Ligand binder design. Structure first.
Ligand SMILES: C#C[C@]1(O)CC[C@H]2[C@@H]3CCC4=CC(=O)CC[C@@H]4[C@H]3CC[C@@]21CC
Ligand SMILES: C#C[C@]1(O)CC[C@H]2[C@@H]3CCC4=CC(=O)CC[C@@H]4[C@H]3CC[C@@]21CC
Ligand SMILES: [Ca+2]
Ligand SMILES: [Ca+2]
Ligand SMILES: [Zn+2]
Ligand SMILES: [Zn+2]
Lengths: 173, 173
């Protein structure tokens, strides 16, 4: 399948942004495969509000890191094996009741419990970058992620309202 | 080496409690090996205050779970492979700067960042149970853990003020 570059040159902005109708979402999970040699960066960001209702999955020292900030929880957590070995890795992020689960290469490596209540009309998903300055993170990192993404599925496509790209998407071909 | 049972009959109380002089602790880590077929229970608990400054490492659905509550963070997180396969597993919990790291069988499986500041004169460590009712946890579980512990090392022995046992310790021999 066709893979895309996760950063556009400088890596100061997402390669793509998707907007969703929260009330229409039935599928509360996302999946994709990523390949990279970069130990730090944003794989994807999501929010309903950039100020007080956001989430980020990235890499720090080659391993998955999740930062999350909402009414119920505020945290910075690293988990799972290193993924900056240049191999393709299957990744799934799911909402299971009030928790968020992260599975890597078929194995559950992290479950953040009691982090989300009810389900805020819209949710945004940005790939390879944030929708606010890096300095705004609970724990800053340099967002640029030099890697490839493919076979990605984001939430509920039927609930997708729109998709934007700062610049044209570059293939990892 | 000699291994001890992690629960005393009912499993309604810790098999042992150790108290430490916080100001004297230089070694901020603990290590041990555990073997069990039980998917749920408390491996160990720690606090400086049972009300607002506590930590718990246990098992839920066979996997490590950490609950933590203090000035800086409040969370319930599961991570790592299942450990209820009846095999001996090396476990290490360490303080690295402002974070808490959990390593299993030599691999880092979880890093809770930004969870602890400065370093509250005393710290208590209870094995196989809590120092408050289970219902008081952020997320309740049944504390009784049917398993064995051996080669355990808790914080800084030189900082240990005292050690108590509700009842006599039972060997897994
Ligand atoms: C709504 C909401 C939120 O609270 C704010 C951003 C949301 C996350 C956005 C990214 C995401 C993509 C998925 O495929 C599964 C759930 C997660 C979401 C879980 C609920 C969150 C974070 C806990
Ligand atoms: C002091 C303090 C605390 O905040 C309250 C209980 C403490 C924990 C008690 C158990 C423990 C044992 C170790 O070998 C490493 C650090 C951890 C401690 C980290 C700091 C904590 C939790 C974050
Ligand atoms: Ca990078
Ligand atoms: Ca049990
Ligand atoms: Zn909100
Ligand atoms: Zn305190």
């Amino acid at each position: 399948p066709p893979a895309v570059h996760l950063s556009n040159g400088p890596g100061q902005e997402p390669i793509a942004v998707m907007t969703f109708d929260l009330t229409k979402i039935t599928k509360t999970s996302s999946s994709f495969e990523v390949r990279t040699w970069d130990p730090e960066g944003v794989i994807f960001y999501g929010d309903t509000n950039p100020k007080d209702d956001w989430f980020m999955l990235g890499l720090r020292d080659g391993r998955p890191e999740i930062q999350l900030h909402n009414h119920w929880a505020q945290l910075t957590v690293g988990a799972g094996p290193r993924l900056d070995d240049g191999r393709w890795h299957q990744v799934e992020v799911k909402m299971e009741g009030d928790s968020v689960l992260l599975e890597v290469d078929g194995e559950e490596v992290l479950r953040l419990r009691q982090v989300s209540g009810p389900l805020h009309p819209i949710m945004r998903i940005a790939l390879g970058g944030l929708l606010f300055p890096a300095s705004n993170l609970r724990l800053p990192l340099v967002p640029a992620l030099d890697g490839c993404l493919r076979r990605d599925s984001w939430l509920d496509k039927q609930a997708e309202i729109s998709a934007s790209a700062p610049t044209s998407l570059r293939s990892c071909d």
